[model samples]
Target: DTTITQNQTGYDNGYFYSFWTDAPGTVSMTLHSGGSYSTSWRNTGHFKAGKGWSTGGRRTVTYNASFNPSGDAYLTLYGWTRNPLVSYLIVESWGTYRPTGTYKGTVTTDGGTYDIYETWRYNAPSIEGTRTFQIFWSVRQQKRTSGTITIGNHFDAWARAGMNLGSHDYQIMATKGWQSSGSSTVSIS
Candidate 1:
């Protein structure tokens, strides 16, 4: 099932998964639980899928539970590439309950020259079984004579449960680009 099943016994809360992709063709996946985050990348260098790229190659990094400041449960995926320019992608998902409502948000960067998009989805099982959801986010920087353009992508998920709140889910996907060292355009889905 796309969503983690709430365990009624023991302390095996569940697991969260996220995926990210880069324009240069890089991809990454991450898993998180409790307050910890772990990441796995396709490979080093630039991304070139199916072309001299080894499918068996993988990298794994682990984060402690202290990484999360919100105290909520979530998983996030992020990708970034920099050389001629910089770009990134991110995706995230939350558990069954969160304070924020399911919706989309927008941000502006590059002195209003670029815009960023972000979206969140809060889903519940209709009648149990299995369910899946897909989120896509992309960004392209306009050619400019001055300033360096930076792009990024990320995904995250979180959940909170309690006797009062019951169970709720929060998920977000985002992409961003910057014209200068500090200027950028952002998008989320």
Candidate 2:
């Protein structure tokens, strides 16, 4: 687990940034990165590093993202890297997709209520510009001005349901946190 300081954001000094890919959209960190924001543990009061997709095993990912959405056609969620492939755990913060896509039921993680969905993209394109192959477990909630919303424990629940994205190991989706952006998270200022 971790604490918020300096700018009220989860900060970590990830040594090895493995590999991750981005889609053809804007990437931002309104919440903490997946490593901390999207934890592999059911409990996040004690935010821990390497407890996310960086290890060579499978587990659950919990979270409580603090922020509002631009409410555009775009969605913001945690990205997952699986060797030459990657996907995201979509979170609908402020949109009509209240639990977007076909309903996949509900999951309780990070002490929050969430509606789940299993979806696929028709012509979803990656940042690479090539068509993307991916599945969607979009999470959405009523629009909130600004607050820390629980994204629920994802991987664990998904694992129970046999949800696999084809990654031998799960690594917390990469973010600019470890980049020269001078911080391990996006600036909320």
Candidate 3:
């Protein structure tokens, strides 16, 4: 099931799947509010048992979401390198921002204790978007209308720091629920 509608009036429709995808059995969204919509910014994840990169495993992310106009919603985890795509990256994204309660740093994987947040992105002209970013994430500060989250597969903490995103892999995202696979065709106000 998938539907992302938006005709005009400030776009707000999104859905992405990678890191060896297969979790799009459900997700539907179509929002219209000319007031404020920095693109509903949505995401979904959960899958296990080897695919792209190994030597690690574990993923548990429960859903149901909130944050609009003012909450600055964000809960994302990413590390990617797709199809011989020239050293792609976004190797970090661990931010659970719920209207401030801002966290700084901490590293301890598979054993939990994530509260790291750092995000920087620029997908210029969409240029076939290969992906290159710095995003290391972690949650459990506060701010939720619905929750459930767990993420691991440190891959040696990004293969021992940057440049080590080294053919990135592993991904997870969540911003404001409701999305689907494919059927295309979308419309808005």
Candidate 4:
């Protein structure tokens, strides 16, 4: 099985956890000012597709900024694409108690057009002052003609405000396709 790890240190006083490809495809870690880390898993929004197809999924982590602790936390989202197509990563932000679709802002990191099998890494706050933010990373197989494509071996960090500041949520979505075979594997992690 593939492994993904997250490390958090400092007085920010919070816990650190992770999500791997082997589980429900979603995980969450929360750190409390009282020096505690909480971990959980949910299928809230996880999907997988075969080669040459499209799919959408989402996940989020929440935190209470009022604690005002000090610590450095990191999230490593790793995965592999099996076909030549474009992929995108988007991150957004909203209030602490807002609903899922309430967050706003979109920063897309695209893999360009026509490429097979790629690995990408994105840090939170693509821009400074993007604290209290929500993040969404997605992969899609660009529409193409006469071919088959697959995407899997996915991994990512699951936590509530680990990489971003507290008071935020996140979501992820994607699509894939192959004109001929029409088989694709697009999953949200």
Candidate 5:
């Protein structure tokens, strides 16, 4: 078990794992030899799958987890893209209430319907350090704890809605909490 209280990134069993916190917090991540792990955290923190990026393609991600939260938190397929520098989210489950912004449109995939939204981060911190960028959201209408996400379907949906995406950066399956506390035992492949 590795306890992380600051920004960190590394690889475990051929999969990349990362943790980042803007507010004071503690995160405990356990790496399994078979490429799956469990994590627990408190306060504002994010734990990511840390899969290296690639241009849009058919990438299927499977996940199952026992997630419990006490405040604002999310189990989401998350990532960043360069060239155009965009941050995106396919929110699977969330604590408290669902998040929303300027609503773009909607798309249905993987037996669920998602409401698409687009927002901007001006001079905000990111994988490429502090800079302005776009944040694209695909919030599921109904939440689920485990399922298969054919991530490319989302890109196709967003493109149809006129959302601009660049070359892939680091795509991740992330658990994020803000001013909250939570823990999860997750398996992803």
Candidate 6:
């Protein structure tokens, strides 16, 4: 078990792993022999299988996760981009609180409908450290613990909604907990 209490990242077994927290927490992100991981966290943290590249094209994301959160948390496709400096979340399932923003419209893909939203952060913590940026969200209307995500479908949807992304950065299939507790076992490809 790899225990982490602060920001950290590593690549092993053909997969990238990342852990980041904004508050004190006891967290463990264990990577399996394969390209899968199991993680548990108390208080606050984010864990994931990460990668870096352009946020364009048909990147078919097929994932299976056993996710449970005691409070506010997000089970989503998360990432960041440069140039325009944007942070994005394609939320698949969530914990206690459902994330919200100004309703931009909806996108139907991967056999589900997701609501689109955009929110801004002023001098907020980001993948590139503290800076103001936009958070583009694609929150599923009907939550599920496992499914496929046609990433390009979302990119096109967001663009049609005038929420274009920027040059690529690290993107991941992640679980985020905020002042909460949770455990998740996930595999992505």
Q: Ranking by lDDT, best first?
A: 6, 5, 2, 3, 4, 1
Report every candidate's CA lDDT.
0.22, 0.38, 0.31, 0.23, 0.76, 0.78
User: Candidate 4 — which residues are off by over 4 angstroms?
Assistant: 1-18, 21-54, 57-82, 85-87, 93-189
lDDT of 2 by residue, 23-56 (tens): 2112222233333432121111212122233343
In the range 121-155, model 6's lDDT, one tens digit per residue, is 99887768889999999999978989899998999
Q: lDDT tens string, model 4, 1-189? A: 112223221222222222222233243333333322333333323211111112223323222111110111111122222221213332111112111232222222222122112222245332232232333332222322112212121212212212222222111221111111111111221
lDDT of 5 at 157: 86
Compute the lDDT of residue 50 as modeled in candidate 6: 34
lDDT of 6: 0.78
Which runs of model 3 end up more than 4 angstroms from their true locations? 1-26, 34-114, 117-128, 146-189
The predicted structure with the larger lDDT, 3 or 5, is: 5
Q: Find the candidate with the highest lDDT and give its number.
A: 6
**N/CA/C clash count, model 5:** 0
- Tens-place lDDT digits, model 5, residues 1-189: 554555677776677776666554466656655446666766654444333233434579888877787887888888888878898999999989798988989989989999999999998988789999999999999889899888988998888888878887767677777666778766787
TM-score of each: 0.18, 0.45, 0.25, 0.17, 0.89, 0.90
lDDT (C-alpha) at residue 89 in model 2: 58
**Alpha-carbon shift of residue 5 in model 5 (angstroms):** 4.1
The ten-residue window of minimal lDDT in model 4 covers 67-76
Assess candidate 2 and give its TM-score to the true structure: 0.45
lDDT for model 2, please: 0.38
lDDT of 1 by residue, 91-170 (tens): 22222322232333332333223223333333522212232222222222232212222222112211111101112232
- Candidate 1 deviant stretches above 4 angstroms: 1-16, 22-25, 32-35, 40-170, 173-189
**Prediction 1 TM-score vs. true:** 0.18
